[PDB]
């Protein structure tokens, strides 16, 4: 009548464990079996005065059947049922309001945003910024790895580098689990190791073996001989033989930045970092491309801010500006803004707990 309904709330996720892994047969009917919980005796019964009684793992088992492409594949290959599911995933967003969903609302957009990898508009995420501002109630256990893991691929569009350093840590925090050690931990270091070749360096080649298989990161170690050293010849031989390893998820599209660093970092291995350079000395290492197009190599990196240089049209005199006057006014201030907010960051937590 009253108490008997409350005691059956925790009975949802109990018996649904044995319906995962081993027996995958028709898991979309389980969604219809989940609908027996969803519509009746939940939305039409409760007054929506409760918060902690709704978890993100309720509907999380739906999309897990879409990437199988073997047994379930929705109810049909046409994938016409996901139209209702698209409104079903967002059905709880309308339930989230000013006075409703002070906690679960945080975990709603996430799985919806985690669904935007290969399907769904990713430009609405810029429009989701208006509704993205909420106070964070708590972080418990497995959230840390579930925020930016799939979102580490956002930087594969906007063409940005330094941002990937801050958000790649979310993939390696509490990454290994019982069933996630093989499945979700491999993709963590695959996106982590490539970012280590974009700006910084790899601390150790064998340090990543304890988490991800070294053979999976093996081609990235050969790219260190090419991308990190800025060599185009050894880069083409690496992509050709390892192209089979590039057939994984979003492992091909990261090669766009791998071949761009060959030009960017290639300037660094060349003496262009030094002040006085001539074009006839430049054509030696860049001979693999051409002569007259070298002026496009240096000039492109000047507007982006990698290195500044002056090019002569006759003999190709290269004068690169070396700034010894930096870190004087307003240059360190960008770092000073972070050092100021670190004091009260951990100090205000003492008043809370």
């Amino acid at each position: 009548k009253t108490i008997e309904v409350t005691a059956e709330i925790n009975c949802f996720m109990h018996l649904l464990v044995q319906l995962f892994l081993w027996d995958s047969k028709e898991l979309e009917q389980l969604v219809e079996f989940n609908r027996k919980v969803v519509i009746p005796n939940l939305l039409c019964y409760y007054n929506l005065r409760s918060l902690n009684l709704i978890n993100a793992k309720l509907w999380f088992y739906i999309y897990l059947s879409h990437e199988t492409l073997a047994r379930s594949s929705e109810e049909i290959n046409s994938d016409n049922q996901n139209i209702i599911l698209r409104s079903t995933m967002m059905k709880f967003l309308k339930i989230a309001s000013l006075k409703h969903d002070n906690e679960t609302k945080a975990m709603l957009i996430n799985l919806i945003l985690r669904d935007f990898l290969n399907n769904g508009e990713v430009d609405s995420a810029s429009d989701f910024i208006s509704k993205l501002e909420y106070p964070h109630t708590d972080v418990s256990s497995s959230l840390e790895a579930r925020y930016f893991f799939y979102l580490s691929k956002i930087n594969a569009i906007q063409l940005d580098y330094s941002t990937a350093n801050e958000y790649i840590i979310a993939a390696i925090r509490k990454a290994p689990h019982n069933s996630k050690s093989l499945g979700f931990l491999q993709q963590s270091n695959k996106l982590h190791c490539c970012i280590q070749l974009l700006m910084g360096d790899i601390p150790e080649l064998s340090f990543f073996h304890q988490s991800n298989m070294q053979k999976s990161l093996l081609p990235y170690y050969h790219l260190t001989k090419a991308v990190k050293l800025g060599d185009l010849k050894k880069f083409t031989s690496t992509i050709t033989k390892y192209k089979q390893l590039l057939l994984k998820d979003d492992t091909y599209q990261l090669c766009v930045r791998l071949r761009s660093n060959v030009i960017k970092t290639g300037i660094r291995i060349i003496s262009l970092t030094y002040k006085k350079i001539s074009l006839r000395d430049i054509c030696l290492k860049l001979n693999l491309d051409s002569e007259q197009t070298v002026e496009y190599m240096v000039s492109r990196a000047i507007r982006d801010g990698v290195i500044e240089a002056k090019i002569n049209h006759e003999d190709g005199f290269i004068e690169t500006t070396e700034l010894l006057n930096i870190y004087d006014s307003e240059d360190p201030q960008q770092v000073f803004d972070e050092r100021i907010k670190f004091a009260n960051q951990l100090h205000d937590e003492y008043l809370v707990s």
């Binding site: 360096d201 601390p203 080649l205 260190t224 001989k225």
Partner: peptide
């Protein structure tokens, strides 16, 4: 250890003996 430590091109042996023979033949 970074890539410079695990690199080990083993080219230091051949390049040293070659440069010594080139200078002696320029006499």
């Amino acid at each position: 250890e970074n890539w410079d430590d695990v690199e080990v091109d083993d080219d230091f042996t051949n390049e040293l003996k070659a440069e010594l023979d080139r200078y002696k033949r320029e006499n």
